[PDB]
Amino acid sequence: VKLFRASEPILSVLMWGVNHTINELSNVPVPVMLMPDDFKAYSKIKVDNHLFNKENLPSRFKFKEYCPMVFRNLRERFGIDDQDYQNSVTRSAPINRFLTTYDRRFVIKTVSSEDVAEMHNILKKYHQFIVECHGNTLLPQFLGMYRLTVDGVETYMVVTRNVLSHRLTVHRKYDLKVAREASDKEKAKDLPTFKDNDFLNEGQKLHVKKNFLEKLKRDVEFLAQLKIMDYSLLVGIHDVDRAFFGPGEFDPSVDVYAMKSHESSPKKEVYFMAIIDILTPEQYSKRFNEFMSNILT
Amino acid sequence: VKLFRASEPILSVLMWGVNHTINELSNVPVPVMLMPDDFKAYSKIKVDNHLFNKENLPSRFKFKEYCPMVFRNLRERFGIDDQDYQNSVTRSAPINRFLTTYDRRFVIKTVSSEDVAEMHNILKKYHQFIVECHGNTLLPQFLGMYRLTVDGVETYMVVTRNVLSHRLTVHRKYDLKGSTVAREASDKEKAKDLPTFKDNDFLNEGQKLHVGEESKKNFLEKLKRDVEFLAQLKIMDYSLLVGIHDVDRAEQEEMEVEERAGPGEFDPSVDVYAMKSHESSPKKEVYFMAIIDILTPYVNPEQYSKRFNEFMSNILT
Ligand SMILES: O=c1[nH]c(=O)c2ncn([C@@H]3O[C@H](COP(=O)(O)OP(=O)(O)OP(=O)(O)O)[C@@H](O)[C@H]3O)c2[nH]1
Ligand SMILES: O=c1[nH]c(=O)c2ncn([C@@H]3O[C@H](COP(=O)(O)OP(=O)(O)O)[C@@H](O)[C@H]3O)c2[nH]1
Ligand SMILES: O=c1[nH]c(=O)c2ncn([C@@H]3O[C@H](COP(=O)(O)OP(=O)(O)O)[C@@H](O)[C@H]3O)c2[nH]1
């Protein structure tokens, strides 16, 4: 009995909508191939209840899902079962614009209308690229894209697989990208978001092999070839020593970006690494890949 | 995996709609009491898909369900699981406005805006009457009420449990009102495969139904209660539907089917209007008898009750 009880009403709508669309999809056959119209398609449901089920849901709301067939296929190619996605979103309200599902498995990012249009422009080439990778890639893994309408205001969301581990507490986070550095406001947060200058001014390195770079070069060559800029690389460090289940112990089919540190590392660490924010040139490609090529040993 | 394949889009939308509302209802807890809000409530969904899932459903339709909590409660009170209701509507399209679910268990009647109004106007008294009779009534057992919009057109439908059996063939059928006037079946009707005979055809045929004292008394007590209730609510033009199933003929036809390559026993938990004929009776028969068509408000209602009951009393011995 899924009460869609949430910290606030828009989360109740997100839960109700992902539950709804994923069931509806379970009654839609898996095609032999996607078709171009699947790349221009959408689902839209408008709910108008009166004196009914208003306990946790709003009474009037709208839910739209962009390209349901394309994102169900992507979900498949990334190895995510549809019922697991639905459970991660509806079993418990998502948590803290940036959310994760209660089980920290997926992140729900609020995006702009421009970002939704941009993804619509990149989607067929992105999907074909993921086919040709067999999902082995450092790009964001898009699982769904939704518009919600609550109290007249529209909100747009993109669901991606979490870069960081959903079980291991991550101890230092870097948003590696002129020159950028952490605001002292951000620098005073419970888990800071250090940017590019303070990974060099701190002396951290990540000691591992070379095939990470082989995947990254393909990814960023693709991003540039699609005229995308402004993307970052997200890096997380987990210090095993800080500390049933275990320490440094993770499932690589769930934390897909995780990487064990070499025996040669000073600290006993596990790293997580992936590309983020790819919804918006060629020079960016080379400068950014250089920066990240000089951080593995 | 449910395609909702149907010969007409409206049927597909009906199947989608009952599926949707029953599954939504399964996330709403089951209340201790009904609140009065529950009798003025409704649920509305408006679907506008685009290049998506258009094999069977329309891209654009609307579905409204009335007092979903009250009819869920009624379903409970009549012994019907929500899961079974959903499955009879959605496993395969309803068939031949009048339909029954593929498994013959429930009847789906297209009704009018005024019928929906009168159903609201009587629903609270109807629920309490069902409550204080424990579901023991000849009246229609209402399980759902919906409004479909396909191609900008609104269709109201009312779901009821079948007066007739879902297994036993029904060989003769009458629609009796007890009216002073000459209710007789047209040559048109009388020329159909299973015609619905009316009063004067029931009398000019000398049909009686030997049911036996115990069932006859339960029946006449049920009917007296029910039609006093209808008179209280100023309701008229309701009929008694009677179906006769010939056990021997059923066996003959059954064997003529099996030759191309119990008997007369029914389950009163599903065929709730069903009665076996008396031990010492001419032919082995099974009857189904219930009241139908009770959504038309205001011969007076008390006068209608009187004439109706006086007629139905002597239709069975
Ligand atoms: O005594 C009542 N209590 C009610 O609670 C109630 N709810 C509906 N109705 C009757 O239903 C019919 C039209 O159907 P409906 O009302 O569903 O259409 P609508 O006017 O709401 O929508 P729309 O056609 O403008 O889009 C009309 O006779 C409504 O008066 C009720 N009568
Ligand atoms: O636990 C997390 N798992 C993630 O997978 C994840 N992805 C991003 N973030 C954070 O959100 C902002 C990036 O957002 P962005 O889209 O790259 O850029 P912008 O600030 O323009 O929105 C920064 O604060 C990032 O540290 C994540 N946190
Ligand atoms: O629960 C039921 N199971 C049935 O199997 C059944 N068959 C008919 N009816 C009712 O009887 C009248 C139609 O009789 P009809 O003469 O065939 O058609 P109509 O009078 O509209 O021309 C209407 O009240 C129908 O809803 C049935 N009710």
UniProtKB/Swiss-Prot annotation, chain A:
Highly expressed in brain, heart, pancreas, skeletal muscle and kidney. Detected at lower levels in placenta, lung and liver. ATP binds at residues 161-163, 173. Residues 6-296 form the PIPK domain. GTP binds at residues 162-163, 173, 277. Keywords: Acetylation, ATP-binding, Cell membrane, Cytoplasm, Endoplasmic reticulum, GTP-binding, Kinase, Lipid metabolism, Membrane, Nucleotide-binding, Nucleus, Phosphoprotein, Transferase, Ubl conjugation. Transmembrane segments: none annotated. It is found in: Endoplasmic reticulum membrane; Cell membrane; Nucleus; Cytoplasm. It is an enzyme of class 2 (transferase). One of its GO terms (cellular component) is autophagosome. Residues 32-38 are annotated as: Required for interaction with PIP5K1A. One of its GO terms (molecular function) is 1-phosphatidylinositol-4-phosphate 5-kinase activity. Ubiquitinated by the SPOP/CUL3 complex. Ubiquitination is stimulated by PtdIns5P levels. It is a peripheral membrane protein. The modification N6-acetyllysine is found at residues 62, 109. Participates in the biosynthesis of phosphatidylinositol 4,5-bisphosphate. Preferentially utilizes GTP, rather than ATP, for PI(5)P phosphorylation and its activity reflects changes in direct proportion to the physiological GTP concentration. Its GTP-sensing activity is critical for metabolic adaptation. PIP4Ks negatively regulate insulin signaling through a catalytic-independent mechanism. They interact with PIP5Ks and suppress PIP5K-mediated PtdIns(4,5)P2 synthesis and insulin-dependent conversion to PtdIns(3,4,5)P3. Homodimer. Binds TNFRSF1A. Interacts with PIP4K2A; the interaction suppresses ubiquitination by the SPOP/CUL3 complex. This is Phosphatidylinositol 5-phosphate 4-kinase type-2 beta. The lineage of its organism: Eukaryota, Metazoa, Chordata, Craniata, Vertebrata.
